[PDB]
Design a protein around this ligand. Structure first.
Ligand SMILES: [Fe+2]
Ligand SMILES: [Fe+2]
Ligand SMILES: [Fe+2]
Ligand SMILES: [Fe+2]
Ligand SMILES: [Fe+2]
Ligand SMILES: [Fe+2]
Ligand SMILES: [Fe+2]
Lengths: 288, 288, 288, 288, 288, 288, 288
């Protein structure tokens, strides 16, 4: 099974705006480039987020990490047994993502996934944020999470759980209209309450948002003000019912894709009981 | 196996008296109604105790929780293999109990049991006690425990352990008369010392008592005084020999059913040694 | 010297609105009445806030606590030596405020102050909030703080420090207009960063706001939503530069008087260095 | 496998001397009698040591505890499979030892062993020592340990490990004469460094000593003085190389059987490496 | 008495080199300018180090902080009583250093000292290091320390202790030649082992070095490499005998003035015993 | 699988120089001799390092420890199944190494390995360092680690992982020349980040270095100075990227074999993710 | 007042025996010589115990430490005011004891005392014990304590308390014969329960014993065995009633002077109540 979400690549129409957004607003460290992708760091990893030019204005690929070469071959076996097409990343691709091995595939609705092992770390170039943020919570929980939009949540669930080994944490019925709600399914693969959530939202993007977790509540408060100065806030500060992430949301430069910047969630384990919630917000998060 | 006791439903002759008892005396939060049942909360769950009108004046059903849908199907398999009749709760019932799935059955002596998963939580309506109680100890240990009266403890034991997966903690020989004792068997299914105890008591009720665990010793002391003002005390403060719950007992409005309000018990695990005790009270608990 | 702020009395045009505000929105416990004043509790004290009818729509009196009878006589001596007029509260007044002794005086700009000792506690009637709030931080730090509006900050400073024994913590230059700021002076008399702040604001009220400190960040988040539902929010969540209180502001039913509901400030002692800040908000607190 | 050593029974020529020894010198609580045996307590158990009259002046039986009835049947199966004779204790015997079930057998060299479950606890009669001792370390580690004398350590080892499930901790070569040592084998069955040690000593007793573990170093120091006043000391205070028990030894009233009264040993687990030591004493323990 | 060292101003021949040194090498945050001085931050203070153009290539002034206005007047009284000339900083100077009041004087050998209160803090512009450094240890211990070169240590000692209220921590005999040592006197005014040390070194500078204290050992290790890349290292890593600061030394761009970048010293209090050391280095610090 | 590295034997041209090096410089305790080998201790074990005369000037054997006799037989089975030749150490050899049993074999490139159980401990002769070192970190992590030079890392990897049960922690690409790097593979067998690393270095020795871990940072600093006085330093203090050992390197008296003396590394477990690093030093370690 | 006992000098008939005793038996570090005195260390101080040749076979002087030069002058003033003769140590003496200043005097019964400040520390030569001892408890509590024999305890008490500033901790009536006891008075001058005790013993020595405090109980146990091997033990292990030092006693090479080697005493402060004890030993300490 997948151990954690390790990296995200975006293909965007406004590379300079994304560069400013990730550095001066979010606080990530610029980390050079690989090919036509600008790289950004949140920790000891050589890169966590890549930004390349493209008309998609969307998530172009997600890197799903396993712990060693044998684990990667076991995932190849799981894909074969499930009839899921995949290819082995070539040397050029391994070099581009700075990994020792990877399998390239897509989820049932077209999102490219890369299952990899052996990522590059650069402790001799210690992390230096570009904006005042004390650090991010990553480690064994990976980079954060994202909410994946899908046309068929049951079909997506079968793939992410049965093939990739994610596990359902809980469900939130998200009220859309007067008598319309969407059941968002939240999936974990480590202690992070969720790494991927699945929802049948009427949005023309592959994801609704990605989330980064900062070390302190002040990190979140300060970030809110930077994103507000940029005119990007989409939600007031609030706290979620299920993971209890205390966060705000803001627009990325790609329309309809948001970032969530948060602190202090609950973590999970093998004893996490599936439960259902009727609201996303325990408090706050008023939409603006 | 069952993971925890999640809810209790009572069918009672005096609904208003039960309402006052659970709120002003015990401290639970009123939480509206579902059908003809008044609902009461002790924590983040949408409800923990339901009270409906009925001549039984007794426990009408107990909800036994598992952690996910697959666990529920495994319980269905266990019931089938054991020859225990059950039905699948219909949509109306799922809606009524606010669960994602449930199996309806009875124990060997007629107590309706509901095995369920996916209960509703409402963190956007944070718990507010109706009387001064700092909170209850629930979580993975469920709502509390009850003592189930049975005509044949061996037969009840075989069902609760072999079919439902409860585990014997210990036994207390409860002296009834000069040369008559009843061997009460205490069963766990999580860290709570017991969730169900079985005893062959000469009482015409399905249970002898249910127990709620408060966070502090003062919570218990204050509650004693509220129940004393109501004229309901049945035992002085005391502490049990086996779980070391420090509690008092009081009459509910249903004759012969008591509540136990306690604090500070021992918890158990896979290393809990079966032992036998000759008394229920390490100290106190004088009957009044 | 004064040890802490113990109580506040308001004279208001809409007593029912204040009652609902203090209970259902703020979470205080209704605690009966004394004379024509409705009483409200935040802790073990018989009362902390009193609300009486009056056209002022303002703070009518503040209770400044000392620790014993001899301390009260020493304050009487300080008042005499400073030429500050005062009277000794009569039996009726002592009974009304539930204190063993008190001195009645005014600050230089007309705010009635009551210096008292021997307040009433009622631990047999344990605190029960009227809205979901886990508790307030009071104890030796008293009930909270207020910002006192004055026409002459130097004159007010001389009285509060030299006569009453408050000590300057720090100053914030609060920008009012393009080239106009008001230097707010923050005074402590115990570990609370400030109990009274002095500012020459162009407001027709005796105070700008009073502040209550809740135990948790969720207490603050939940309260924000209750005050938002009431249409009373005046500031978004934020954190102050000097005391680092994380709070929001809301309108009380008395025009131009606000409440601040907060969490997590720094505390002070004899080693607190006077410093100057150019902004009230380290982050957040956008006015709405 | 055996979980812990729970009780010891001695058959002795001088019952009154043993009574005084166990109470006034060691500090155990007198706990009545069962049949012709005087009972002694160290904790919540109804009894830990029994003393009956007999010419043996030796250990008459040792009680080896398991956690439940099914575990007892599994031990019966292990005995059957190994060809070890045993009988099931009858009702009279169960009553005498205050247990729910037991198997009676002998080790290869004639020591009666009783494998049992469901011992009696009496928390309503809290432990009261007969001499100043703050308490004993028992719980999951059982009552203590004993050193079993055997003519053939390999044969004894095969029985205790393969049949009963004890595990080797380590070995000490105990120098007896100029060019003669005995390899003492120390066996655990829980966190206690050893519960039974095996040694081919030239002593005409079944055991060399039994050990009780007190809570504090002062407990040991005070006990030394009581046993010294009784003229029973056989070793000065010292500390063992392998378990690091800090103890002294003294003669029981039965010639050639000693007691060890100690404090502060190391505990073990599944990661304990077998090692060999050339001396019993890290420091002290000079023979007197 | 002086409470702590709060700021340092340098007058230097190569302002750009100092700018790069303080930011990219040391890690301080650039914080704009005041007049012809470039400002640098280490924490919440608006500035800690100022760099202005000048031929001195030396420390131009040191800011000595007190906690309030009355403390400043008491220092004025001490200066008057001691016959030490001083002037009161005018409005322009107060504005330039961002303080509420200050006294300008010199030590007996010409170093300008500024005794001040009410420094500016800017928590709304949170500290952001320019190089990877997790933070500095400042707070009540002030910015760090410096070693003041003097022609007459006894005369300097009398001034710093009797007039300014510094206290001797200890002395190190620093061997200069074969039979020549200089007794360096280390003075504290808060928990920092020393804030000013006095030594009669044959150097043509006012100070030998200034020291900044980083939060972690890795901060120091990483900084060593940055200063080594710049070709500035003057000492290998080492640890001092008296304060046990673990540090290295490097050249600033002003010849003969060094910086010390360190971690982990001992702190002092009223119980610190004066002692004498024969070496500066407990280990390391080899000169290069 | 192998549990830990327990001992090292060197065959050297200058036994007296090695004796002085291990005692006065490193701090090990001289512990007599066995045959023609001088023995040295770091802890409770009778010996950890042996030095015998020989022209090799290299590591002559490494002792790989398992926890009991059955574990040793399981290793014999693994060797048989893998076709790896081995012999059983005879009584003389067991006596020489002070072990209860051992298997003698070689790795694929000629390094003699001894797999053993039942080492001798001598707690009655407590460890006494020969130079100021507070102690070493050994225990379940064994004596330390070494870097094994091999001509074929893949072949060495297959043996150490598949046959002996070591597990890959991570890889560092060690740059040798302008366009030449060697991929060093770091292997663990317990919590120690690595016990053996494999690298295809162009060195004519079996190992590049062995490492000992001291308890404190001062232990390392003091040791640096002792080895510097001896003229043996080969690296300045630094910290590694992968295990984060803070250490320095020095020459042993055998040319081309170094010692690493370090502190404070990270430890590993079953959740350690394989990663790749481009440098050995997070900071420091400049070669001298 | 005196702050602590810092050093002891002995004049002895057998310097080599004292050298072996202090190093190989007690564990102190040999630290060269000063004049005709051999020096010994227990910590960072250049020396703690000096041994010179002399027929006295007794304590020749005790060093009483104060914290600074002004404290030394205040002691000179106290001596003058009390009429106690003293001289100022000359340069040669200061050099000999490695102190910055000292006053030479005697107690009323001829023991030379040296009151000093500014002792030498040598952290660049870290402490290395000569026998297995983990370290000594010194610091602010000084080197240990001694029991001073006096002909008139009241007269000695007046001097040590009124002149030197020691404070009575408690008294023990030490039974000498059938109807003869000596009231030993125990005096502190810091947290150490006592630094000097006064007793009218019929011994022809200035002191009965001096005591060193080791860090661990094993340090004491191991030391007991070393002193036993040397044939010097005078008391078995035991614990004192008043300070609760757990120690043993042994003969020094000077007849009638003993050493006490201990662990774990209680410490004192301004709230220590004077009490009386009838025995020296809470347990143990049997004389041999
Ligand atoms: Fe999210
Ligand atoms: Fe109960
Ligand atoms: Fe406020
Ligand atoms: Fe033993
Ligand atoms: Fe320095
Ligand atoms: Fe290494
Ligand atoms: Fe003593």
């Amino acid at each position: 099974s997948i151990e954690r979400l390790g990296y995200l690549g975006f293909a965007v129409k406004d590379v300079p705006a994304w560069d400013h957004f990730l550095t001066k607003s979010v606080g990530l460290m610029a980390a050079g480039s690989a090919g036509d992708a600008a790289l950004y760091r949140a920790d000891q990893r050589a890169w966590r987020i890549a930004v390349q030019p493209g008309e998609l204005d969307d998530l172009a690929y997600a890197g799903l990490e396993v712990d060693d070469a044998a684990a990667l071959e076991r995932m190849a076996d799981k894909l074969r047994q499930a009839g899921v097409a995949f290819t082995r990343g070539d040397e050029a691709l391994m070099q581009q993502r700075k990994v020792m091995g990877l399998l390239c595939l897509q989820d049932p609705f077209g999102l490219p996934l890369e299952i990899y092992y052996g990522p590059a770390e650069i402790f001799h170039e210690p992390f230096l944020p570009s904006a005042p943020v004390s650090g991010f919570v990553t480690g064994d929980q990976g980079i954060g999470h994202f909410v994946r939009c899908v046309p068929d949540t049951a079909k997506a669930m079968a793939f992410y759980t049965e093939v990739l080994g994610f596990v359902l944490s809980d469900i939130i019925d998200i009220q859309m209209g007067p008598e319309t709600s969407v059941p968002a399914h939240f999936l974990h693969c480590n202690g992070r309450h969720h790494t991927i959530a699945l929802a049948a939202f009427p949005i023309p993007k592959r994801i609704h948002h990605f989330m980064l977790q900062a070390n302190t509540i002040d990190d979140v408060g300060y970030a809110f003000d930077r994103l507000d100065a940029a005119g990007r806030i989409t939600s007031l500060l609030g706290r979620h019912t299920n993971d209890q992430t205390l966060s705000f949301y803001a627009d990325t430069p790609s329309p309809m894709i948001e970032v969530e910047f948060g602190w202090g969630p609950r973590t999970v384990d093998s004893s996490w009981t599936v439960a259902r919630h009727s609201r996303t917000a325990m408090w706050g998060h008023k939409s603006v």
